[PDB]
Amino acid sequence: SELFRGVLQVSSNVLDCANDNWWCSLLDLDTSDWEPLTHTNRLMAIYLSSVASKLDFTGGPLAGCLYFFQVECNKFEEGYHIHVVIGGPGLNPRNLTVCVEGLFNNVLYHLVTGNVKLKFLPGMTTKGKYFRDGEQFIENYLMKKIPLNVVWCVTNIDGYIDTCISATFRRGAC
């Protein structure tokens, strides 16, 4: 496949501006092969789930796209960062950033107080082109993370729908 990849940063300002809608959102999350999700970790898992649900039924440039979203927090990291792997017939290097930002920010809009938005940074090659190695990046890198270093993961890609939130499979992949 030829999937793009990039990252959205989540500063601590985003979580500081989380509103009642976000803190009170009730959504089922399958943590039976995961660590318990509480506090702002659960908010990020809920958010990622909501973004995926929106994407599953969106038209326009994002129609029919394959995606893999993974929210992470490293040691000493404030906030979170979201790895995005995404591709489809309507997505191209000219519209990728606006389309991904619009998708994530349209969901975030109802969850934060104020004009708080995320930005998307595409991963770029040595020659300055957008990477199209997204599926290999999932296999080589993203799937080798274990919770709660990886906080949550959502995908519609065949090879990962059954392992994306399997701590057991992820542990064996490292």
Author numbering: 1 to 174
Question: From the publication, what sentences describe this entry?
Answer:
The nuclease domain of NS1 (NS1_Nuc) is responsible for DNA Ori binding and nicking that is critical for B19V viral DNA replication. NS1 contains one nuclease domain (Nuc, aa 1–176), one helicase domain (aa 302–457) and one transactivation domain (TAD, aa 523–531). NS1 belongs to the HUH-endonuclease superfamily and it shares conserved ssDNA cleavage mechanism with other HUH-endonuclease members. NS1_Nuc is of α/β fold in nature.
Totally, two NS1_Nuc structures (Form I and Form II) were solved. The Form I structure belongs to P41212 space group; and, it was refined to final Rwork and Rfree of 18.0 % and 22.2 %, respectively. There is one NS1_Nuc molecule within the asymmetric unit. Except the extra Gly residue at the N-terminus and His175 and Ala176 at the C-terminus, all other residues are well ordered in the structure. The most distinctive conformation was observed for the β2-β3linker in the Form I structure. The main chain of Glu77 forms one hydrogen bond (H-bond) interaction with Asn74. The side chain of Glu77 forms two H-bond interactions: one with the main chain of Asn74 and the other with the side chain of His81 (one of the catalytic residues). Compared to the Form II structure, Glu77 is shifted about 7.3 Å in the Form I structure. However, mutagenesis and in vitro assay results suggested that Glu77 is not involved in direct DNA binding and cleavage by NS1_Nuc. Superposition showed that the overall folding of NS1_Nuc is very similar in the two structures; the root mean square deviation (RMSD) value is 0.8 Å, based on 169 pairs of Cα atoms.
